[PDB]
Amino acid sequence: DIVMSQSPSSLAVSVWEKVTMSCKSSQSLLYSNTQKNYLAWYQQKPGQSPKLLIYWASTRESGVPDRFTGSGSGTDFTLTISSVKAEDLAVYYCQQYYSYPLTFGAGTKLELKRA
Amino acid sequence: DIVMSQSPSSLAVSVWEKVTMSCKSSQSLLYSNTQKNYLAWYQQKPGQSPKLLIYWASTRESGVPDRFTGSGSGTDFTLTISSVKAEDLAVYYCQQYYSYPLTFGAGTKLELKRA
Amino acid sequence: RVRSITLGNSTITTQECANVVVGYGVWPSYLQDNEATAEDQPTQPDVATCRFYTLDSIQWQKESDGWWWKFPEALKNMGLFGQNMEYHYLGRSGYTIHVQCNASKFHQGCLLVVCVPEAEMGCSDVEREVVAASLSSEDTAKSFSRTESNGQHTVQTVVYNAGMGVGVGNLTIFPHQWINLRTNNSATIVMPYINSVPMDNMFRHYNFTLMIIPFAKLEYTEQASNYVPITVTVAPMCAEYNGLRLASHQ
Amino acid sequence: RVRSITLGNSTITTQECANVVVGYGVWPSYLQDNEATAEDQPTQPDVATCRFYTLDSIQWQKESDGWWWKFPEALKNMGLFGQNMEYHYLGRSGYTIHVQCNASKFHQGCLLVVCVPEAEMGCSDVEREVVAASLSSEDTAKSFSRTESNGQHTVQTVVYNAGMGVGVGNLTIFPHQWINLRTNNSATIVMPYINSVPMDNMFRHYNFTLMIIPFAKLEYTEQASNYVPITVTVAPMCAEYNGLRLASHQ
Amino acid sequence: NINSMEAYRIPVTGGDQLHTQVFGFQMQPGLNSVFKRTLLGEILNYYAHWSGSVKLTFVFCGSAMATGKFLLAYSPPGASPPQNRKQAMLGTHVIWDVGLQSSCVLCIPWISQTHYRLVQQDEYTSAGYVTCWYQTGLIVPPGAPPSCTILCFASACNDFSVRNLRDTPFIEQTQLLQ
Amino acid sequence: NINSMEAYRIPVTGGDQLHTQVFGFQMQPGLNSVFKRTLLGEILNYYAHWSGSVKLTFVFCGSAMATGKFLLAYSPPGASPPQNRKQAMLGTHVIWDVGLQSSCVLCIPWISQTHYRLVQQDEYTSAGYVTCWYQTGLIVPPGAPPSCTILCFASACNDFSVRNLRDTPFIEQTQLLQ
Amino acid sequence: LQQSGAELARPWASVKISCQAFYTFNSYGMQWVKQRPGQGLEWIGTIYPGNGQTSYNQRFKGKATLTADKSPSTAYMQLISLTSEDSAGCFCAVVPTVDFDYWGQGTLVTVS
Amino acid sequence: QMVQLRRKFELFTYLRFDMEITFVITSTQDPGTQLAQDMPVLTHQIMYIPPGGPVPNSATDFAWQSSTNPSIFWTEGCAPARMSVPFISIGNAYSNFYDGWSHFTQEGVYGFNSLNNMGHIYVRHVNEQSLGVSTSTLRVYFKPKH
Amino acid sequence: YHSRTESSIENFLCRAACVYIATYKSAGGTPTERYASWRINTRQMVQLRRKFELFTYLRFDMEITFVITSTQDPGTQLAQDMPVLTHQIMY
């Protein structure tokens, strides 16, 4: 089994603050045929079904801002959130395409901090 | 393709009124090896994931009352609701196990009528 | 004296020189001309199906009662022979069940390894019938019981009546072998194809049942490993089919 | 004169007596002793893979430009030959592509049916590379185009440069046949195995490409059915493998 | 048509012409715009001398219900191109009846004063012309398309030879790639 | 264990496992950490190409009163390592009954597309894996030690050859000694 | 019983949905249903692991890909070229050829 | 890299040949101060790194003194240096075209990591010249044989 | 069936190897840098030492080759017209 760690498990942040979040793999999800990391990033809105954020651990999807960007290689990754807005308060789960038991990560809960 | 009809598509009823609902198949979902109709009955609570009501078109599930009972054979069926309560207001979908495109029925919306 | 057996370009089994039991006295063979009723030719897959299918090992513990596998369902997922049970309509095959144990000289016990043709089984509840899920699993054994089973649609799995309502000591009538751990170690039975028709559909029909019953129970002292692994190895013989189609069932 | 061809106990194709093209002058054959480098024996599946795999029919319309299939990916899902591409590591096979059309005597047109060994293809965007999803589909044809393709990772599918940057009239250098609807109806090319190694892995490598290009376009009057179906039928020859394992890829 | 497939199809329209020309070219392989890019004329551009015959083949790509006649004339190297069908008849011609045959193989003789012949050197009115003239037209039944298509195929013969290898005129790039 | 003798002894513990693995390695001599320092893989590092078979031998260094069974599986070059004993059984296996034999000679075939094979070049999932699985366990009488030891011995065969001599990767010193 | 967490996608792109089954993948395939709030339930396809078969409804052929591995023991469905018509709740269910049994939760696909 | 020879080789799919490489090295004296003056004779090392062989990162590296890489020591003023390399491939021919991929998963580059590697050629001055600079110009005359 | 001539003892131990690079001047000063010296031993170079130490007992002839390249030293009182350098190598 390949397990996916997430740190921090959750963090509360205000508006316009660049946040990140690491997702470290117990095995390097990078194969030497195409050199394309097998990692997926997912946003599960509060009380909603999750949607795609970053596939191949490097590429964006449509209707997704530059405050969601994959970054890393090997067995350690992170998702830079540059300019946070009022649509990022949710739980985010990373995932790997490599080992057939497709386990997801712990799950970072990006929390919203008000006045 | 085997299509599953439902009539009425929806009906509003009060408390303690025996209601039924027909689900007629475009092909007899009964094979001559075991004589067991291939029909499933399902309750999708308002804003909820559906659950099983009647499998083999004849047998009940656990935690299910006698106000949910399969009835019929061949290509015409119905689900007798004997004593309605405050947990039947929902949408119900019938389904067939026979043809591989497992299409569901139209969907009866058992509506609640108040004072 | 430790002669190796290679059957197909995948299988190796190591075995010493011991005794075999050949069926009811016949070796498995191919169907001749004045034996069949079908309107076509068999086209036997000799080039791919004759190999050793070593099933998982069971643990003969001190308090175990017996195990049975129904055939040919016991090779339903085992490789290409399971594919031929899908993509055909009729089938006909003999088998060479080889059963062997790995015990020390400080263990003791005795097994009876029977092949029962048409071992139809009664239900644990009278005025009721069995289901197919209680007759046999697809690759794992089904355990006999010391006490009385009491289910609704299960099998009467009491051990001294053998699931058929007979005396368990009289199962010696069918092809059998005794594994006595003092002297014997292995057992190998060569079953032919027995039916009343030349070819049957091998999904509904169970041709025979391989039962392994311990008559003298396993004893050991406190140093010893507290089980003896029994390893069954089935090799099909002279398999031939008819009715090429898709996988209509399962 | 309407002689039937039966290849395996599944296939029947009806065909008259016409001309064949045999490769570069050699028939497909089995590998001899002083030709291989692998450390094992081939174990060719002659008993199951030699049959006719009739692909879906394309419609030669008035405004069509050409079609290509890459091989051996063109039989990736076609039956047991697709299974051998999964459960092996190396492979080596010749083919007998048979192409025929069903036109009336009131239709006119001309096709060129080429088998291009190592038809490496350039991309529609310079300073970029193709993907595998634009080179070939698994069983359906890939269309040439009259105008210029303009994608990012696609193939330069213009018709007069044949996807390789050459003159389309010079593709007559490779094994070919002309289907001229006035006189000819069918075309049958027998391709051997051409490689620089005796056996290659048939997932990454494309051995050859079968191109069908109309040089004189299809014309018809208003009564006529406004297409001519072109039916391709591929039969593998002398297929042999090595490296039995599971389906590691796809 | 050079940027399409229409530069391979010789159009034979159907109707009332009966005295006009189908095509015509100067018969000099490896120098003519018609021949310098085919397989024969790509190999001839790698050499400075050439000698041998050229074999032409014209395939009528029409329907089996169509019928007509073409006059395939060949003029010698020191001779003018024929201007009408009557001038081409008195020269060297074959009559290609497309109802009987679908292909007309036309082999061209090797006539020169010297042994070999320069490929890049151009000698006007010293190569030969192969023209084609309508003889009857193109007769079709009701249901057959009136217009049709011819394709031409050129190759060498067994007496062919080359000499004095050099660089092809086609490749102009000089500096190495990257 | 690399700085001790424990990096030669394959531990076979005794008890209740019956479904786990004993060992397993990627079968590429002269490149694998398992094989590059043995006599076969020290000679292969002096050359750039190699071709031939590898012969493995596993010696059960237990007591004569011990009995068990191991499943010695070999997977082909384009194939995944077996994950349980049931997957390894359907591949290419031998059953090594250590009560009957003390050594299990396992020769490995030479499978490649080309004639020779590069030694330093690494081609993942194109070499083969040799794994070993528990079949029964290890049954001992009272008085015999429950845990045991296997040793492996690798060599070449008669069809072995090398080509394109070069310098060994192991020696890094460059300047002369003193 | 488990399904992917809510995720936000972009049209003309793909989504990979996961499903987790405690029960072993044998003798019975994994169902995939797409729910339309305005209409009813629609079957997408099933991948039967016991015999390894993969199948889709004609409507979803070319749209849905079903893939189940062995050691991870998780069922996946991928959709591509997403449009607003694909925004829906997708459920995975089991089938032992005896019933469709239960489904469970599921991330609401939200193409935006 | 050379289009004129590339077009002649790309009239064929599969080729098999030995190499016959010849090196025309002409040196000159650089201008500026601290001139060469009395320069004794220039010796040049031409090293053929066999495919998969140690490749020099720069001058005065150990790769130059590696026994594995065949080398020629040539002194200026006489006939040019010549070497012949046989057909060096795991395969049975070189391929001008490769309709395929480098990894077994159809991943990587569309026909560039193929077994069509012939090696490298590296040339340097053997001399230790302190005063003055000498700029040499190499001309490689490649030729296939058989 | 391949050939094993590439791994014979002659083809494995007979390659020329640069084992010693020294320099020697041609004018006075200390009487040490005016000549070069090498005691013939196959132990100072590790790469060749490891190949020879796959064997206990060896027997061979030697084939020594000397690559001598000279240069002109900088400073004043230059070489100017130097006629030709002759070198004595003594075994």
Tab-separated table of N, CA and C in Angstrom, chain D residues 54-135:
chain	number	residue	atom	x	y	z
D	54	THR	N	-12.049	-9.234	-40.050
D	54	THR	CA	-12.671	-8.265	-40.943
D	54	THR	C	-13.049	-7.020	-40.156
D	55	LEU	N	-12.341	-5.922	-40.393
D	55	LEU	CA	-12.602	-4.674	-39.693
D	55	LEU	C	-13.875	-4.020	-40.227
D	56	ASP	N	-14.274	-2.922	-39.592
D	56	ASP	CA	-15.466	-2.200	-40.014
D	56	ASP	C	-15.242	-1.534	-41.363
D	57	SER	N	-16.328	-1.368	-42.106
D	57	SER	CA	-16.246	-0.820	-43.446
D	57	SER	C	-16.249	0.698	-43.406
D	58	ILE	N	-15.384	1.297	-44.212
D	58	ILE	CA	-15.360	2.733	-44.396
D	58	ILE	C	-16.180	3.059	-45.633
D	59	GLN	N	-16.652	4.295	-45.706
D	59	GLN	CA	-17.476	4.761	-46.812
D	59	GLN	C	-16.642	5.688	-47.681
D	60	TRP	N	-16.280	5.219	-48.867
D	60	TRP	CA	-15.605	6.051	-49.856
D	60	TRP	C	-16.628	7.001	-50.453
D	61	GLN	N	-16.661	8.229	-49.959
D	61	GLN	CA	-17.564	9.220	-50.503
D	61	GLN	C	-16.877	9.996	-51.619
D	62	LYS	N	-17.574	11.007	-52.135
D	62	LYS	CA	-17.049	11.782	-53.251
D	62	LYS	C	-15.907	12.686	-52.816
D	63	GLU	N	-15.926	13.134	-51.566
D	63	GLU	CA	-15.013	14.156	-51.076
D	63	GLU	C	-14.028	13.610	-50.049
D	64	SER	N	-13.801	12.302	-50.038
D	64	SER	CA	-12.875	11.690	-49.103
D	64	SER	C	-11.460	11.742	-49.656
D	65	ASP	N	-10.482	11.720	-48.749
D	65	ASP	CA	-9.088	11.940	-49.101
D	65	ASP	C	-8.188	10.738	-48.896
D	66	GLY	N	-8.443	9.908	-47.903
D	66	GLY	CA	-7.583	8.771	-47.646
D	66	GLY	C	-7.676	8.338	-46.203
D	67	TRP	N	-7.244	7.103	-45.952
D	67	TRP	CA	-7.308	6.501	-44.628
D	67	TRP	C	-6.031	5.720	-44.360
D	68	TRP	N	-5.611	5.679	-43.095
D	68	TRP	CA	-4.486	4.836	-42.717
D	68	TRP	C	-4.765	4.117	-41.407
D	69	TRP	N	-4.275	2.883	-41.311
D	69	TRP	CA	-4.221	2.116	-40.077
D	69	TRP	C	-2.774	1.787	-39.759
D	70	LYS	N	-2.386	1.936	-38.498
D	70	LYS	CA	-1.070	1.509	-38.047
D	70	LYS	C	-1.158	0.085	-37.523
D	71	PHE	N	-0.156	-0.718	-37.851
D	71	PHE	CA	-0.106	-2.109	-37.442
D	71	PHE	C	1.107	-2.343	-36.551
D	72	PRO	N	1.011	-3.231	-35.550
D	72	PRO	CA	-0.061	-4.166	-35.208
D	72	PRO	C	-1.099	-3.636	-34.239
D	73	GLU	N	-1.195	-2.318	-34.068
D	73	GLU	CA	-2.214	-1.768	-33.185
D	73	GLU	C	-3.615	-1.911	-33.762
D	74	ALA	N	-3.737	-2.148	-35.070
D	74	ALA	CA	-5.032	-2.297	-35.719
D	74	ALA	C	-5.776	-3.558	-35.297
D	75	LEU	N	-5.106	-4.518	-34.668
D	75	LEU	CA	-5.735	-5.708	-34.112
D	75	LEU	C	-5.536	-5.762	-32.605
D	76	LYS	N	-5.685	-4.623	-31.933
D	76	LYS	CA	-5.452	-4.577	-30.496
D	76	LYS	C	-6.604	-5.181	-29.708
D	77	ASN	N	-7.836	-5.018	-30.184
D	77	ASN	CA	-9.006	-5.599	-29.547
D	77	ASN	C	-9.557	-6.797	-30.302
D	78	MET	N	-8.980	-7.139	-31.452
D	78	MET	CA	-9.525	-8.182	-32.314
D	78	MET	C	-9.142	-9.547	-31.754
D	79	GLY	N	-9.916	-9.985	-30.764
D	79	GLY	CA	-9.946	-11.390	-30.398
D	79	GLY	C	-8.708	-11.857	-29.661
D	80	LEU	N	-8.277	-13.074	-29.995
D	80	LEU	CA	-7.168	-13.718	-29.312
D	80	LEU	C	-5.822	-13.118	-29.694
D	81	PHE	N	-5.704	-12.558	-30.900
D	81	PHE	CA	-4.480	-11.869	-31.288
D	81	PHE	C	-4.249	-10.626	-30.444
D	82	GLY	N	-5.321	-9.971	-30.004
D	82	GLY	CA	-5.170	-8.888	-29.054
D	82	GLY	C	-4.781	-9.367	-27.673
D	83	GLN	N	-5.193	-10.586	-27.304
D	83	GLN	CA	-4.785	-11.149	-26.021
D	83	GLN	C	-3.310	-11.517	-26.018
D	84	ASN	N	-2.788	-11.980	-27.154
D	84	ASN	CA	-1.372	-12.306	-27.238
D	84	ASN	C	-0.509	-11.057	-27.217
D	85	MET	N	-1.045	-9.924	-27.670
D	85	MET	CA	-0.321	-8.668	-27.521
D	85	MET	C	-0.275	-8.229	-26.067
D	86	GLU	N	-1.233	-8.673	-25.254
D	86	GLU	CA	-1.200	-8.378	-23.827
D	86	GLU	C	-0.256	-9.321	-23.094
D	87	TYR	N	-0.522	-10.622	-23.173
D	87	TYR	CA	0.152	-11.607	-22.330
D	87	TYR	C	1.412	-12.163	-22.980
D	88	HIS	N	2.262	-11.278	-23.496
D	88	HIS	CA	3.572	-11.644	-24.021
D	88	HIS	C	4.461	-10.412	-23.950
D	89	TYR	N	5.722	-10.590	-24.306
D	89	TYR	CA	6.674	-9.491	-24.306
D	89	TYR	C	7.224	-9.179	-25.686
D	90	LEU	N	7.549	-10.197	-26.471
D	90	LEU	CA	8.016	-10.022	-27.834
D	90	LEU	C	7.038	-10.690	-28.788
D	91	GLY	N	7.054	-10.241	-30.036
D	91	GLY	CA	6.166	-10.796	-31.038
D	91	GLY	C	6.696	-10.571	-32.434
D	92	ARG	N	6.235	-11.413	-33.352
D	92	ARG	CA	6.744	-11.412	-34.719
D	92	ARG	C	5.689	-12.038	-35.614
D	93	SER	N	5.206	-11.290	-36.601
D	93	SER	CA	4.065	-11.754	-37.376
D	93	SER	C	4.053	-11.101	-38.747
D	94	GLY	N	3.705	-11.888	-39.764
D	94	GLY	CA	3.355	-11.363	-41.064
D	94	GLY	C	1.848	-11.257	-41.207
D	95	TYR	N	1.397	-10.554	-42.239
D	95	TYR	CA	-0.060	-10.327	-42.380
D	95	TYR	C	-0.467	-10.519	-43.834
D	96	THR	N	-1.748	-10.757	-44.086
D	96	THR	CA	-2.265	-10.869	-45.469
D	96	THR	C	-3.448	-9.917	-45.562
D	97	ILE	N	-3.171	-8.630	-45.729
D	97	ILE	CA	-4.249	-7.613	-45.826
D	97	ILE	C	-4.992	-7.824	-47.134
D	98	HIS	N	-6.291	-8.049	-47.057
D	98	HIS	CA	-7.132	-8.191	-48.237
D	98	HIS	C	-8.135	-7.049	-48.237
D	99	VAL	N	-8.096	-6.223	-49.275
D	99	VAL	CA	-8.932	-5.035	-49.394
D	99	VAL	C	-9.828	-5.209	-50.609
D	100	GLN	N	-11.131	-5.002	-50.432
D	100	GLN	CA	-12.047	-5.116	-51.556
D	100	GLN	C	-13.188	-4.123	-51.406
D	101	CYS	N	-13.736	-3.711	-52.545
D	101	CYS	CA	-14.794	-2.718	-52.632
D	101	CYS	C	-16.022	-3.323	-53.298
D	102	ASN	N	-17.184	-2.748	-53.007
D	102	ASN	CA	-18.447	-3.179	-53.607
D	102	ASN	C	-19.031	-1.992	-54.359
D	103	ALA	N	-18.638	-1.849	-55.617
D	103	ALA	CA	-19.144	-0.797	-56.478
D	103	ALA	C	-19.917	-1.416	-57.627
D	104	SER	N	-20.751	-0.601	-58.258
D	104	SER	CA	-21.479	-1.023	-59.438
D	104	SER	C	-20.625	-0.778	-60.678
D	105	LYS	N	-21.199	-1.033	-61.849
D	105	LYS	CA	-20.506	-0.707	-63.086
D	105	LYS	C	-20.719	0.735	-63.508
D	106	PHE	N	-21.555	1.475	-62.789
D	106	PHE	CA	-21.839	2.869	-63.077
D	106	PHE	C	-21.106	3.808	-62.136
D	107	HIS	N	-20.243	3.270	-61.281
D	107	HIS	CA	-19.313	4.024	-60.455
D	107	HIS	C	-17.949	4.072	-61.127
D	108	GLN	N	-17.145	5.056	-60.738
D	108	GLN	CA	-15.782	5.159	-61.232
D	108	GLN	C	-14.883	5.708	-60.137
D	109	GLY	N	-13.616	5.333	-60.195
D	109	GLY	CA	-12.659	5.766	-59.197
D	109	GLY	C	-11.457	4.857	-59.183
D	110	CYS	N	-10.460	5.265	-58.405
D	110	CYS	CA	-9.200	4.540	-58.335
D	110	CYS	C	-8.605	4.705	-56.952
D	111	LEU	N	-8.156	3.605	-56.360
D	111	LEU	CA	-7.504	3.621	-55.063
D	111	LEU	C	-6.083	3.097	-55.183
D	112	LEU	N	-5.228	3.554	-54.280
D	112	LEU	CA	-3.878	3.031	-54.130
D	112	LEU	C	-3.753	2.494	-52.715
D	113	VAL	N	-3.419	1.217	-52.591
D	113	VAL	CA	-3.402	0.515	-51.314
D	113	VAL	C	-1.949	0.171	-51.012
D	114	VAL	N	-1.323	0.919	-50.109
D	114	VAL	CA	0.104	0.801	-49.841
D	114	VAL	C	0.293	0.158	-48.475
D	115	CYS	N	1.378	-0.600	-48.318
D	115	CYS	CA	1.869	-1.017	-47.005
D	115	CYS	C	3.248	-0.404	-46.806
D	116	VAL	N	3.345	0.563	-45.900
D	116	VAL	CA	4.543	1.383	-45.733
D	116	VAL	C	5.289	0.889	-44.498
D	117	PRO	N	6.430	0.215	-44.644
D	117	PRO	CA	7.206	-0.177	-43.462
D	117	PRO	C	7.894	1.028	-42.839
D	118	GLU	N	7.738	1.157	-41.517
D	118	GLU	CA	8.269	2.250	-40.698
D	118	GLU	C	7.821	3.612	-41.222
D	119	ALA	N	6.504	3.790	-41.272
D	119	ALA	CA	5.920	5.044	-41.732
D	119	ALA	C	5.858	6.023	-40.562
D	120	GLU	N	7.028	6.535	-40.200
D	120	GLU	CA	7.101	7.556	-39.168
D	120	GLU	C	6.522	8.857	-39.698
D	121	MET	N	5.729	9.528	-38.874
D	121	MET	CA	4.916	10.644	-39.328
D	121	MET	C	5.297	11.924	-38.602
D	122	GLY	N	5.271	13.034	-39.334
D	122	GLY	CA	5.592	14.317	-38.760
D	122	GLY	C	4.382	14.998	-38.168
D	123	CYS	N	4.635	16.023	-37.366
D	123	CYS	CA	3.568	16.690	-36.642
D	123	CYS	C	3.042	17.881	-37.430
D	124	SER	N	1.816	18.283	-37.095
D	124	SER	CA	1.182	19.405	-37.769
D	124	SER	C	1.769	20.736	-37.340
D	125	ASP	N	2.437	20.781	-36.194
D	125	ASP	CA	3.130	21.972	-35.727
D	125	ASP	C	4.614	21.648	-35.685
D	126	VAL	N	5.419	22.444	-36.387
D	126	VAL	CA	6.860	22.293	-36.263
D	126	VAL	C	7.304	22.783	-34.890
D	127	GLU	N	8.491	22.324	-34.478
D	127	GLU	CA	9.029	22.497	-33.123
D	127	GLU	C	8.077	21.927	-32.071
D	128	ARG	N	7.443	20.804	-32.399
D	128	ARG	CA	6.546	20.104	-31.490
D	128	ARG	C	6.543	18.631	-31.870
D	129	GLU	N	5.877	17.816	-31.052
D	129	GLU	CA	5.882	16.374	-31.245
D	129	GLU	C	4.465	15.817	-31.202
D	130	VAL	N	4.289	14.660	-31.841
D	130	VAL	CA	2.989	14.003	-31.878
D	130	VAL	C	2.720	13.300	-30.553
D	131	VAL	N	1.454	12.968	-30.336
D	131	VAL	CA	1.052	12.070	-29.272
D	131	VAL	C	0.635	10.748	-29.902
D	132	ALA	N	0.486	9.726	-29.061
D	132	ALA	CA	0.076	8.421	-29.557
D	132	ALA	C	-1.399	8.376	-29.912
D	133	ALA	N	-2.203	9.285	-29.367
D	133	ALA	CA	-3.630	9.319	-29.647
D	133	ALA	C	-3.950	9.906	-31.009
D	134	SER	N	-2.992	10.560	-31.658
D	134	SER	CA	-3.196	11.128	-32.978
D	134	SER	C	-2.553	10.309	-34.084
D	135	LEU	N	-1.706	9.343	-33.741
D	135	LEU	CA	-1.116	8.491	-34.762
D	135	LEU	C	-2.118	7.478	-35.283
